[PDB]
């Protein structure tokens, strides 16, 4: 059970420098090589570069001249820097465990350079737009409590930057029949998404439904009650 935790800034202005750090928690740094991977919007994966416990690092040829990768073996962390950042560098950056140190017989090298486990990921957005907190509006259910079928209600998360925004219902008590749509970039430059959930119509008068909207960039947490309109 190896754990990988990462952090960094997800919003940068152009021409700035991206900085991210990954943290290995349940394993030896020495045993494995550590690599950085990014995933473009609705695209494939690109390998950035790897590093050993020895200072030695290998980079992708395309990014060789804009990359720095280091390892702080005291903290068991390895970092990634990307200089002169651009919107083309906007992607989800992942930590990963690369090849295994094998001393036999003897390569003295890292062998299976494929990545498991992966990091959770850090969505870096390259824009000069400033961060905005979201507004949460109720998507009230029309349906009468006594219709006796299924009813749908939800929350509308409007006008925020940047991504992402996580939405839960009743702190996660309710996860069944919950649909959270991927956000859409409006013409205003602000993101917007809605989270809906289908529940029995006979519980619109007993059960209380609250959506939990979190936006980490703005440090915004909102709990919204969704109740049938009178």
């Amino acid at each position: 059970q190896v754990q990988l935790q990462q952090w960094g800034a997800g919003l940068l202005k152009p021409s700035e420098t991206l900085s991210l750090t990954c943290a290995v928690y349940n394993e030896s740094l020495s045993a494995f090589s550590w690599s950085w991977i990014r995933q473009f919007p609705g695209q494939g994966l690109e390998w950035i570069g790897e590093i050993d416990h020895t200072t030695s690092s290998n980079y992708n040829p395309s990014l060789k001249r804009r990359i720095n990768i280091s390892i702080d073996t005291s903290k068991k962390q390895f970092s990634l820097k990307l200089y002169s950042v651009t919107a083309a560098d906007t992607a989800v950056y992942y930590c990963a465990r690369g090849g295994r140190k094998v001393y036999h017989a003897y390569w003295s090298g890292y062998v299976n350079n494929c990545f498991d486990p992966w990091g959770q990921g850090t969505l870096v957005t390259v824009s000069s737009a400033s961060t905005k907190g979201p507004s949460v509006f109720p998507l009230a259910p029309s349906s009468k409590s006594t219709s006796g079928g299924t009813a749908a209600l939800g929350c509308l998360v409007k006008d925020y930057f940047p991504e992402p925004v996580t939405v839960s219902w009743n702190s996660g008590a309710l996860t069944s029949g919950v649909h959270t749509f991927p956000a859409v970039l409006q013409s205003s430059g602000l993101y917007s998404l809605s989270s809906v959930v289908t529940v029995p119509s006979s519980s619109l008068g007993t059960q209380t439904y609250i959506c939990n909207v979190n936006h980490k960039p703005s440090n915004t947490k909102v709990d919204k009650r969704v109740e049938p309109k009178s």
Partner: protein, 213 residues
Amino acid sequence: EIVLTQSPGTLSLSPGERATLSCRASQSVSAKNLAWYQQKPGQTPRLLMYGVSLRNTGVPDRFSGSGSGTDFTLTISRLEPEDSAVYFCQQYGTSPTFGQGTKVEIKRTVAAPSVFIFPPSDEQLKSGTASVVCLLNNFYPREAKVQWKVDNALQSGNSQESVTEQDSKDSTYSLSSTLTLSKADYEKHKVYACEVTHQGLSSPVTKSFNRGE
């Protein structure tokens, strides 16, 4: 330097059928340094296969790796509704590179969407903008047509839509259309209809409401 090309780009098959995925390399791939990944919706890529044929721990039998040198092959013997994801192949023989990815969806019986419509909240109206949301819940196939009418007038360029990824259980999709009007234009009209056309419906279905009703 080695470019990996996967085919086909998209794969649509029913559960229980054999899914054959291909991966070709621009250069020869040394000594079985080829790996396969699986990326389910909203998740990170997880190692599915490595060493060409070696099956990662926790991975079912049904997945199989094949091929050598230039052409490689990933095979899913009996597809499941949870097998719907994007599959990447990767070579570690040289400096690592991935393929463009091949997406796989699971076919199922025609599911007609359940249409819900939501009026803009009162709290929002004080902002000066009215967002009307039409919901299409649980349908297949992915393809759907949504039209907005204000007062029997077709609306164009004032809506955006979001479609969820295919569900891992029932293999359905869900869509949401958001009509954006200013508070002024919203208060001027009365009828707001959401018309939906799908292959699972005999005739288009409309959900509508009257402003301030």
